[PDB]
């Protein structure tokens, strides 16, 4: 994929969820019409996502140290990659995967 990631012929299936319509009070005398009357509903709950990832171990004979991703943010008014004073979660830095090196 041009945006990056894993191209999949069979991607994870889409998970669809709706609130089942709860109809409101029907008319005592039957009428033939489309039913537009509903009780206002919403739902909430918890969802767990569990993914298994396969890894390739770094195997290298390089003598000198390599590049590592580290915290070099220094002094801040809140922790980086944490909530701020008002509780907003702050990730201001994009992090790629390419740090270790390998020969062509």
């Amino acid at each position: 994929p041009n945006l990056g990631g894993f191209g999949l012929h069979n991607p994870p299936p889409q998970v669809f969820i709706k609130n089942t319509p709860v109809p409101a009070d029907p008319p005592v005398e039957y009428v033939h019409q489309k039913w537009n009357s509903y009780i206002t509903q919403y739902s909430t709950g918890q969802c767990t996502v569990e993914m298994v990832w396969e890894l390739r171990k770094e195997n290298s004979k390089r003598w000198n140290p390599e590049i590592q991703f580290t915290s070099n943010f220094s002094n801040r008014t809140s922790i980086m990659f944490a909530p701020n004073e008002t509780g907003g979660y702050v990730e201001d830095r994009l992090i790629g995967t390419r740090y270790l090196t390998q020969n062509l």
Partner: protein
Amino acid sequence: ADGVGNASGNWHCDSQWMGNTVITKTTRTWVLPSYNNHIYKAITSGTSQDANVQYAGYSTPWGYFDFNRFHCHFSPRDWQRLINNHWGIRPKSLKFKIFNV
């Protein structure tokens, strides 16, 4: 054990990381002279009158091996794998060889 024309050992330098243990192997070429020309010498601080620098002892015809620094056993890259990923280290066992004399 072995003749003139056979090597009595092979070169081994690697680091192996298995589980909670790392094994370092390293090989060097060493040179030994004949020290003191085969005698022991009583050595002192000489005529020095300063008590702080005074000493008495012996130099020997013998040499010795000192591997007691970490960079003997760890490449910088291995030292990096150690310090970034682990909370603790201690030595467990030691094997030493002299060969191809």
